[PDB]
Amino acid sequence: FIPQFTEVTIEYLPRSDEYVAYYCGRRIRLHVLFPPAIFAGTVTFDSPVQRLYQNIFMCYRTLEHAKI
Amino acid sequence: AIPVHPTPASVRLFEILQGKYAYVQGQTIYANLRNPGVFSRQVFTHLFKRAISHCTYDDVLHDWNKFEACIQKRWDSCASRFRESTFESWSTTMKLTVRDLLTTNIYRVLHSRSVLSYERYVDWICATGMVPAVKKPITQELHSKIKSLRDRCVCRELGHERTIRSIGTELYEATKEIIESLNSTFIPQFTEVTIEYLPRSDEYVAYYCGRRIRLHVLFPPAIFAGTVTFDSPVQRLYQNIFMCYRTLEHAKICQLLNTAPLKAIVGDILTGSTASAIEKLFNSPSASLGARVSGHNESILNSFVSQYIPPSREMTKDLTELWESELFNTFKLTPVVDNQGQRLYVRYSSDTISILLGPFTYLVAELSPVELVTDVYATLGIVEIIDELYRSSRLAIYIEDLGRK
Amino acid sequence: AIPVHPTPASVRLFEILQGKYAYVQGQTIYANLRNPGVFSRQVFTHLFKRAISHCTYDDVLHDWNKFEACIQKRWDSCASRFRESTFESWSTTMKLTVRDLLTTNIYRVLHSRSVLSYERYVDWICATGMVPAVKKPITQELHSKIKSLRDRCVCRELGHERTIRSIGTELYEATKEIIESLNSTFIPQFTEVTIEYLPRSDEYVAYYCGRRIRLHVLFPPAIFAGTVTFDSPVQRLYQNIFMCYRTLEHAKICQLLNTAPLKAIVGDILTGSTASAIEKLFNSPSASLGARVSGHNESILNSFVSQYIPPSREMTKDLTELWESELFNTFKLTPVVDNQGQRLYVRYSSDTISILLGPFTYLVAELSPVELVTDVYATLGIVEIIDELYRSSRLAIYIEDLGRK
């Protein structure tokens, strides 16, 4: 089974680094492929979309700015 | 002792691995060489080569003899061309019967969990020219994922071919020798480990979990008396990337500061009913702009207006092909293109596997008996390289030896 | 005594090896000739030649004789073309069974830790025309990294081929003489060592940890009474690169200085809610600009406005092809291109290996018996040069001598 995103969540513990899935209150199995960069202030994911992320948000900002 | 990893300038360099500060179209090709899979192709054709090498000629000639003994009880002068045709079909199903079982077992052993990641490798060498070589002693996964009968369940058929009964077992134990070497090794992430260099009696010391771990210099970084610079593809573009980031945020700053339609000096929003959307921002203070002099006695003689657009997308566009030229040059990437093709098939070269997986598979990964590959070993289909290996294999040359009787 | 290395102008010159001050698309091609691996091609095909030469014709002819003795117990008038075909397949597996042996062993000895690097050489010659030749006496790593049986356990098989049992040992011990010569030598970095010139009774002095080291002039510098100039590729561009850097930082200065939309004379930001983003910088003092007259009695008769954009990207664009022409010319680089190709395959030439690896492998490296390569020795694949060497190799001409019986 693969779920959607909007009602399940995923948890990472930095201390003794593992990852914990959750859906209806249980830890479910998981598979790392692209492990994210956890800095002390934020976590960014090595992903195709987050390699574009703030450029897409910049384009959104200037488009709403243009309509403003 | 002077730090290498967790310095602010070095982690500013390590950020461009991801896209957090600046990103252009040319940086899309950076993940293209960051694609793993060329490493799987490496070990994939290597252990096919290891399987096809240890075969003997005497195991297959009496196999063809017993194959003819099978067909004589099922089926004189016409039997000459009958035996030629049934040997031709026997060669075709020989290629088939090696290909099917081999691609099952090898895609099974290959796509299990491997803690070694080429994805985790290629980002380091282009960032710093340094690799953290970690030897994780936990190696109890291979007997758990694939122990026995995976080579035996698929081959239990009528025709007891001793060729597969000799070679599948030898490759099956051989895969346990090769997956061991790769999952025993480890390349980590960057945001939690560190690398350290000392000036006096200079060595480079890798540190994760409080211990000196192995490592290899690949591109010797320049440590000046005030700063450290890494001979790296990314830091060769470093302040041009940061200058483009600066002028882009500068451009949006001036764009966001000149939004008033009129300049005075003192002496749900995205979609809605446009009539009310007029009202919801006309009362807003975004419309007005009255600039100020600090001193009230301080007076102004004259005033001028100049909105200014800095060439933002012009500064992005040339830095795209800046990235393109640099990652075509220091990593040999030949774009396989059509007539006026816009860079449709970006592929590894001959020498760029010698400069990426050349050091990788032999220095930071301790894979001794593996080889590098060709252009068409990596270009062609991953099952279409199997029969191409077969086209220059020891067994099929023995079969083409049998090709003339 | 006059300094050469640690002077401020020459370390400004040594910086542009890396990307710290100015960088354009033309300087991407600098890493392409900075790529090592062509040096591995050098020692690769040289030890190939040292392997393939030391055969005897008498070894392979009786090897074919015993090979026929093997096949007569396994398999009359048809035996004529049978013996022709089995010799053809025997030549094919002869190429195969030398090739897999050499491909393992020579990639194994090839990708060792080599403290000599082409990367540390090519930057030094193009910077100043001078290389420091260091003879570092520790040479104990070869016996530890490779001792015995790496040439043997791969060939421990049924057919005791005396061709590999004669030639693999000699190529094995030959690598022990060749990797010794390269790892005995040393080319250093720049940021810790220095080069020094005495004008009086002129020689050049090298230094690392207080000793005069060996060294080799290649492009003799111009030593004037005020400064030193080096006949080099990068110092032939030096103040043009600095001029482009100066006008680019000046361009950013004027761009940052004319950001105000309105000119008075006295007398989180990257992404956010744009309605609040207006508010966060309109109150900021970046918006206003009131220009100053120094004297309060000093009055102003007339006042002007002129924003000015200097041609920044224009100054980058011609200097790109400035770098391209210089690194196409003083290092002979022939771009293998397609019809209207955008410089897709930038490759070493015939004569540029004689001007770079020519002096390298023979003057600072004391690799005496090694040879240079062809165009198609460096162009073609590192496994596809094996069979091309085989197409003109003494063993395979002896097999083509056997090609007619």
Numbering used by the authors:
A (entry chain G): 206 to 273
B (entry chain H), C (entry chain B): 18 to 92, 96 to 287, 434 to 571
Sentences copied from the publication:
Epstein-Bar virus (EBV), a member of the subfamily gammaherpesviruses that also includes the Kaposi Sarcoma-associated herpesvirus (KSHV),2,3 is the first identified oncovirus. Similar to other members of the family herpesviridae, EBV has a characteristic three-layer configuration: the outer lipid bilayer envelope containing viral glycoproteins responsible for host recognizing and membrane fusion, the inner pseudo-icosahedral nucleocapsid enclosing a 172-kb double-strand DNA (dsDNA) genome and the middle pleomorphic tegument compartment fulfilled with 20–40 different viral proteins. All herpesvirus capsid shell consists of 4 abundant proteins: the major capsid proteins (MCP) constituting the basic capsid skeleton through forming 150 hexons and 11 pentons, the small capsid proteins (SCP) binding to the tops of hexon MCPs or both hexon and penton MCPs, and the Tri1 and Tri2 forming the heterotrimeric triplexes to plug the large holes on the capsid floor. Once the viral dsDNA genome enters the procapsid shell through the portal that is located at a unique 5-fold vertex of the icosahedral capsid, the viral nucleocapsid is joined by the capsid-associated tegument complexes (CATCs).
Based on the density map of the C12 portal reconstruction, we built an atomic model of the portal protein BBRF1. The portal channel has two narrow regions that interact directly with the terminal DNA. The first one, located at the interface between the stem and crown domains, is the channel valve formed by 12 copies of β-hairpins protruding toward the channel axis. The channel valve is the most constricted region of the portal channel, with a diameter of ~25 Å. Similar to the counterparts in tailed bacteriophages, the channel valve of the EBV portal should play key roles in DNA retention and ejection. Each β-sheet is formed through β-augmentation between a β-strand from the clip domain of one BBRF1 monomer and a two-parallel-stranded β-sheet from the clip base of its counterclockwise neighbor (viewing toward the capsid interior). The portal-DNA interactions are contributed mainly by four basic residues (H79, K90, R155 and R176) of BBRF1. Compared to the in vitro-assembled EBV portal, our in situ portal exhibited a more compact conformation with gradually decreased interior diameters from the clip region (31 Å vs 31 Å) downward through the channel valve (25 Å vs 32 Å) to the crown region (58 Å vs 75 Å). Consequently, the terminal DNA of the packaged genome in the mature EBV capsid is firmly held by the significantly narrowed portal channel valve, which would further alleviate the pressure placed on the portal cap.
